[PDB]
Write a protein that binds this DNA or RNA. Structure first.
Ligand code: ZN
Lengths: 73, 86, 81, 186, 95, 81, 77, 46, 74
RNA sequence: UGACCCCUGCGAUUUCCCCAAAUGUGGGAAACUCGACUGCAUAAUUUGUGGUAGUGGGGGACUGCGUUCGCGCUUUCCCCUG
């Protein structure tokens, strides 16, 4: 049960890709061995150009597909 | 478990869940069925939407590849391994 | 368990259907705990494709949809273990 | 294509229009319910158990424990010792059990047909107090190198008491494997 | 599991009194059953054995499905082996 | 551990390509590798199913959600092989 | 360091209306006040409302449960 | 440390510790004997 | 409102009518009979709804867990 | 390919006793040590129990919108193909 080495992305602005062609963008604050990530200042980033900020959110690792760091870590 | 050991180094064609065919030299495996192919080439069957034309094949060279068992459907022998003798 | 019973069907001929609609008819030669089966002298028929005869084929258990076993199989005697 | 962008032209439908089962009175074959090497064994275990229980009732009706010629003396005075070494001479058992008090009579049980020593005897002391004094000390004694246990004989004192062959007794030296420790004594 | 000992019979009581008892009672009374699978096809037949993985051993099965006007197609399989993951719904004879 | 996992650990630090179940293919330098197939890359080139591409700097990918990986052919010369 | 378990516990104590996304489904979402949760991520709501992006209709469900595997993204209010 | 003693009656070996009341664990017999030493012993055959 | 975990919630839901929606739209409403450690539901006198509208009546129905989308009482 | 006949299966190590061509070659006992041999944590997010369903394609008649007249979307019947 070794957790992932995501210490590099801690406190960095990322853009995550989800299963159903959905994307989000927020700052990472913590992770878990099951890739359960907690990102704050998250935006929904729907299919359209419209943007909706809600802030603190949680994402399930089973549905998290990819995470890119916009701040190059 | 000689069923897999006897087939080491042979030129196997792996069938993917999406319908693709990865033909490469099966080097090694594991309990999860994660295979290692050398000089692999990817083939895919595209349906003809223009008229009754022969199936369109789009080959793609990859080299060394690591296929996940969960994504591996089946595998068969396309031909013997590359003979090193002249 | 029951996979042991699946592993006991060696040297018999069956027809397996896959989750992608592919059909495979051949004789079983070996099975593992993960349901992966190896069929020799087998004929595969992919969806919207032509049948092809393969001398060997190692299939994974996850992509298997179901099997079709012979009619004379002794179920009552083979399920004792 | 991708699982999300795949256009499902005919997604999974229900089963409401596909109920064509067989009628109720068309019951299943009754004789098609059995298994081999699973029920015949339970049947043999039940027969051997009932057969023994019936032999138990016949033995209880024929033989009377209290009305036994071998048994003599007061029941509260008599004592019971088992796990005794077969080589223990009568004099050796006297020298070991007269210490707690004088012994009026000593009885070594023997096999009726084989004649071999059973391994347990009944000792009748002159005074009931000598017996009670022996109850606590005698248990756990070592005679001829083999540990022996000692408890007041309940065959004619305790209500509803019977030996192994009749389903009663104490001690589990031959009970379920790894369930009764051999070190512990009665 | 809650009973990490190797002598645990949790699967036993599960199949005897849990939701999976439908298959035990099905094999007991030799009653038919209709199964809806991920193939969009329904398989109607009897059961002879199963386990925790929901893999049943069927006999005298009848596969049925529909394509597209919608045209129905059916066939028969006297002996087969169905997987559990691909199962969607099970329905015993409601009679 | 597994032989493919070991081949990945030694493949750490070189340019590799990775295709995921969603179809996207990412080719770039590998930074960190783990037993659970979790791969981190840098300065990658992404190709989507439609064909469009993009530019990224630092990326991490879950292992279970990967279809396959392409590693340098020179790795075939490893001492274990 | 805040973890998802502690954050879910905070939202639970706060009784805030948490919205949840579906796995492989983008058009439908569910919102309700969480009552409890297990390690499997299954969540129970007191008064759930199923909202769709295309229809914008909020279907009332009441006290319900939702599987953790189907969850994709949590959102406050 | 072990201090094996031989019981008089049952001739059984048994450990005994200091301050331990002297009694064979096996037969409750109160007479014991020290085991023959291990020291090297020699005898000119005179 | 004290915390009520999903397992006790479903346990209390046992015996009462419940409708469950599947990942592909179809729904099933019936008297909850029992569940297992994996949430394999078994209903009685179940009625199948297709695309929200009533489709028909099935009866006793055993359904796996990994196929259902959600569950709701009544 | 293979009847009959042998062990119920360990690569390595430790101690006791014994046969012995007596430092080797072997047998009767256990001891707890590595192996990825099996069962359960393994059907509850990371492979060993699914949101990768397989749900089509093409030839004739048969609608409409845009049009570069090649086509993108869209609506019907008969045929070959899986
Ligand atoms: Zn002694």
């Amino acid at each position: 049960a070794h957790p992932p080495e995501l210490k590099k992305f801690m406190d960095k602005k990322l853009s995550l890709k989800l299963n159903g062609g959905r994307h989000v963008q927020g700052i990472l604050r913590g992770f878990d061995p099951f890739m359960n990530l907690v990102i704050d200042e998250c935006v929904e980033m729907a299919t359209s150009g419209q943007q909706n900020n809600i802030g603190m959110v949680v994402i399930r690792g089973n549905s998290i597909i990819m995470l890119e760091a916009l701040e190059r870590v | 478990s000689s069923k897999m050991l006897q087939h080491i180094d042979y030129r196997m064609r792996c069938i993917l869940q999406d319908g693709r065919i990865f033909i490469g030299t099966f080097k090694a495996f594991d309990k999860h069925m994660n295979l290692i192919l050398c000089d692999c080439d990817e083939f895919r069957k595209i349906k003809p939407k223009n008229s009754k034309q022969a199936e369109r094949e789009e080959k793609r060279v990859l080299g060394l590849v690591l296929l996940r068992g969960e994504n591996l459907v089946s595998m068969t022998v396309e031909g013997p391994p590359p003979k090193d003798t002249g | 368990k029951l996979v042991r019973f699946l592993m006991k069907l060696s040297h018999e001929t069956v027809t397996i259907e896959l989750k992608n609609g592919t059909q495979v008819h051949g004789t079983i030669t070996g099975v593992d705990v993960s349901m992966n089966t190896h069929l020799k002298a087998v004929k595969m028929t992919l969806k919207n494709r032509e049948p092809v005869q393969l001398e060997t084929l190692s299939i994974r258990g996850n992509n298997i949809r179901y099997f079709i076993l012979p009619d004379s199989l002794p179920l009552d005697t083979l399920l004792v273990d | 294509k991708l699982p999300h962008e795949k256009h499902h032209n005919q997604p999974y439908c229900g089963i409401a229009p596909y109920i064509r089962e067989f009628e109720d009175p068309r019951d299943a074959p009754p004789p098609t319910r059995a298994e081999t090497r699973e029920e015949r064994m339970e049947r043999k275990r039940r027969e051997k158990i009932e057969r023994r229980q019936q032999e138990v009732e016949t033995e209880l009706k024929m033989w009377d424990p209290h009305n036994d010629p071998n048994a003599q003396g007061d029941a509260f005075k008599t004592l019971f010792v088992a796990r005794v070494n077969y080589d223990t001479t009568e004099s050796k058992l006297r020298r070991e059990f007269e210490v707690y008090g004088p012994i009026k009579r000593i009885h070594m049980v023997y096999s009726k047909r084989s004649g071999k020593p059973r391994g347990y005897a009944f000792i009748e002391y002159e005074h009931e107090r000598d017996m009670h004094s022996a109850y606590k000390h005698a248990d756990g004694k070592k005679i001829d190198g083999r540990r022996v246990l000692v408890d007041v004989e309940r065959g004619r004192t305790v209500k509803g008491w019977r030996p192994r062959r009749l389903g009663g007794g104490l001690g589990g030296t031959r009970r379920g494997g790894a369930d009764v420790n051999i070190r512990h004594s009665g | 599991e809650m009973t990490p000992e190797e002598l645990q019979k949790r699967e036993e009581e599960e199949f005897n009194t849990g939701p999976l008892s439908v298959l035990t009672q099905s094999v007991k009374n030799n009653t038919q059953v209709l199964i809806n699978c991920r193939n969009n096809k329904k398989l109607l037949g009897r059961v002879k054995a199963f386990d925790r993985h929901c893999n049943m051993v069927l006999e005298n099965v009848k596969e049925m499905w529909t394509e597209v006007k919608p045209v129905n197609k059916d066939r028969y399989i006297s002996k087969m082996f169905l997987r559990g993951d691909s199962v969607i719904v099970v329905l015993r004879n409601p009679l | 551990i597994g032989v493919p996992i070991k081949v990945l650990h030694e493949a750490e630090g070189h340019i590799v390509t990775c295709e995921t179940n969603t179809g996207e293919v990412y080719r770039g330098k590998l930074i960190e590798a783990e037993d659970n197939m979790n791969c981190q890359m840098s300065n990658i080139t992404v190709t989507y199913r439609d064909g469009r591409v993009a530019q990224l700097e630092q990326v991490y990918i879950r292992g279970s959600k990967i279809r396959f990986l392409i590693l340098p052919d020179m790795l075939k010369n490893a001492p274990m092989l | 360091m805040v973890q998802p378990i502690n954050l879910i516990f905070r939202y639970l104590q706060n009784r805030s209306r948490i919205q949840v996304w579906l796995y492989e489904q983008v058009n439908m979402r569910i919102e309700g006040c969480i009552i409890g949760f297990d390690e499997y991520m299954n969540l129970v709501l007191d008064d759930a409302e199923e909202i769709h992006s295309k229809t914008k209709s909020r279907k009332q469900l009441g006290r319900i449960m939702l599987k953790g595997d189907n969850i994709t993204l949590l959102q406050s209010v | 440390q072990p201090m094996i003693y031989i019981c008089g009656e049952c001739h059984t070996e048994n450990e005994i510790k200091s301050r331990d009341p002297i009694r064979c664990r096996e037969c409750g017999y109160r007479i014991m004997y020290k085991k023959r030493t291990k020291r090297l012993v020699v005898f000119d055959a005179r | 409102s004290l915390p009520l975990n999903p397992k006790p919630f479903l346990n209390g839901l046992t015996g009462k009518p419940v409708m469950v929606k599947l990942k592909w739209g179809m729904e099933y409403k019936g008297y909850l009979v029992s569940v297992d450690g994996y949430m394999n539901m078994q209903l009685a006198n179940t009625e199948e709804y297709i695309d929200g509208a009533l489709s028909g009546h099935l009866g006793e129905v055993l359904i796996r867990c990994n196929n259902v989308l959600y569950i709701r009482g009544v």
